[PDB]
Write a protein that binds this ligand. Structure first.
Ligand SMILES: [Ca+2]
Ligand SMILES: [Ca+2]
Ligand SMILES: [Ca+2]
Ligand SMILES: [Ca+2]
Lengths: 167, 166
């Protein structure tokens, strides 16, 4: 028998150029991260020190999953402003994550940049928000990389893979 | 990547002849084991077995290594007689084996049980309060493992946990 395909350990690290040193001006960097289907990406910062800007129009770290923009980060973790990431965790809405670091023409002070880490994790597609239709008619089974439905005794799974019909 | 392994990441277990009446004098055992790091989560969707004091006649024993996680029988729980309900069970580590034993006979036509299990990554970065952190500075959990990192300015010691200037 062809052995069961297990999870690839997709995880990594991102850091501003020259981290932990000052980061040059007018820098531009982009990273594209993806996890296997059935897996989302979790990312968080261990270090965040950028030029503070009212709407991060100067220096910044933008996180994006597809169209939606997860947040535009900037500012120092030391001053604990509102633009900084802090310890928040970020997740990709699909299985993709796009990160961009943007350094403008000059720095008020010697900002040390940022360091981030990410890791693929299993999406529990059995998880649904309060008041939303349950992912399965009868029973929901989540496993690594996917999920499936099952029926109570006396019933049988419909061709649609969710509906349970009496038998 | 993906750690090569014989057993599937998930599966289903059911008493003989489920959902019908399970034969008498039957004893079956299952061995569930996943790759290093991961652990197994198992739960029952259906549980209908003969009742008995300390589940002596018929039973479903869930053990992980040496420690016996729990023994089950009946349809409901009493004192010294535990019934699964919707509760969840986890393998201490990466190993979990099940045993279903039926004795000579049954008064009522018991339909047995159905169970499902799935492997899930362990968050070794997670620890029971009081215990020291797995890492001195930063803990990174990922599928199948983990590793530590240090604050800027510090470097990780040979032990891959403690951090120090330089
Ligand atoms: Ca600047
Ligand atoms: Ca899943
Ligand atoms: Ca019996
Ligand atoms: Ca892990």
């Amino acid at each position: 028998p062809l052995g069961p395909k297990w999870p690839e350990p997709v995880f990594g690290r991102l850091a501003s150029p020259g981290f932990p040193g000052e980061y040059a001006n007018d820098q531009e960097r982009r990273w594209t991260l993806t996890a296997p289907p059935g897996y989302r990406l979790r990312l968080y910062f261990t270090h965040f020190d950028l030029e503070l800007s009212h709407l991060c129009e100067y220096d910044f770290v933008k996180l994006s999953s597809g169209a939606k923009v997860l947040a535009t980060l900037c500012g120092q973790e030391s001053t604990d402003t509102e633009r900084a990431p802090g310890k928040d965790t970020f997740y990709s809405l699909g299985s993709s994550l796009d990160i961009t670091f943007r350094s403008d023409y000059s720095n008020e002070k010697p900002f040390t940049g940022f360091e981030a880490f990410y890791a693929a994790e299993d999406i529990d597609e059995c998880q649904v928000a309060p008041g939303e239709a349950p992912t399965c008619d009868h029973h929901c089974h989540n496993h690594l990389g996917g999920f499936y439905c099952s029926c109570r005794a006396g019933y049988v799974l419909h061709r649609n893979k969710r509906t349970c019909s009496e038998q």
